[PDB]
């Protein structure tokens, strides 16, 4: 399945952005999705995710309380609302889905995810 | 003049099985049941009956037969029996203490495992109480393990209640997938609609 | 309790014939699938042969197939393992096992309910 990703661009420190991830039909209703980010010389670290249910989201220690994940009524588009942005948030952001259902989200790594969207650049200064 | 061969083929030979948490029930009625295709097979490693002899079923009539189907791992097949405890018996599929019927299980490693792992089969890891016999829970609400509400966010004492099996071909037999069919036989003050070929 | 009494083990040499027997008390033998498991002193339990309640269906591990025969005498509540053409790698503790009220052909350890103490076969 193809995940289509958009959003990103440049913003000042403390500013807001909204990444988008779209997948046709029952995809997001069947497979939990994850937002990841990769800074130039670093590993693809988990940011935030949503269970296929739409009723559960989960966040890395470094974005919980600043970033929120939501989904449209159609359940085919997921949004990463990025508020109170730091320079430390500067990276290429990716969305993805997993067939692997881990009760503890704290055990998810990028290795669990596939159907990677094209990266979108987020820059904070 | 009961109608056609009973669709056991659809149950036993389904290309995909249900996750144990969302276990499937097919009510079988108004059909001729050939049970000999089951108990004469060498393909079923578990065919444990309680109170019912498979050999007599071909000459017996029932109001209804119920086929419950799902996938679990090998080590958990002993939990699909009366008076058992564990994650499956407690939170996924519970037989009653007085269960009368047959539990049929076979290794499905060739069907339900894939290189890289098949994770599509799920079980419930968390529940606030044990299932009553034949109870089914497909709820997907965050399990609140503590006193603080989760409000749709996972974290400390706020966990997703479902978990994938990791079925890989190279798994030990205990961790290999097993397909399970539980046959319940119902007899009510009503016309019998499920008869063996010998009537 | 269910008692599985094994005999017919001991010392033999390669190419020799040994006949294991397992007499059962209290497992309703007639409706029980019966199995022979072995454990080498550096390996884990493997099923080598199993037989259905009627003694019609049999299963053998590849390592013993064509060389071992499992059979049963239901009136005598006894299961036999005729072992022919024994090679040095058959040396192990052989356990007979009962899967009670089981009308199938079990071969996994968890599918069995009662176990004998096990008898030493050294080839
Ligand atoms: C399932 O398919 C196999 C292979 O064709 C067949 O032998 C078996 O009888 C089928 N099972 C049932 C319950 O009909």
Residue numbers in the entry:
A (entry chain CCC): 4 to 128
B (entry chain BBB): 331 to 529
C (entry chain AAA): 3 to 125
Sentences from the paper on this structure:
Here, we report the isolation of nanobodies that bind to the Omicron BA.1 spike protein by screening nanobody phage display libraries previously generated from llamas immunized with either the Wuhan or Beta spike proteins. The structure and binding properties of three of these nanobodies (A8, H6 and B5-5) have been characterized in detail providing insight into their binding epitopes on the Omicron spike protein. Binding of the SARS-CoV-2 spike protein to the human ACE-2 receptor at the cell surface is the first step in viral entry and blocking this interaction correlates with neutralization of infection. Structural analyses have mapped out the epitopes of these nanobodies on the RBD and have shown that the majority cluster in two regions: one on the side of the RBD, distal from the human angiotensin converting enzyme-2 (ACE-2) receptor binding interface (cluster 1), while the second are close to or at the ACE-2 binding region (cluster 2).
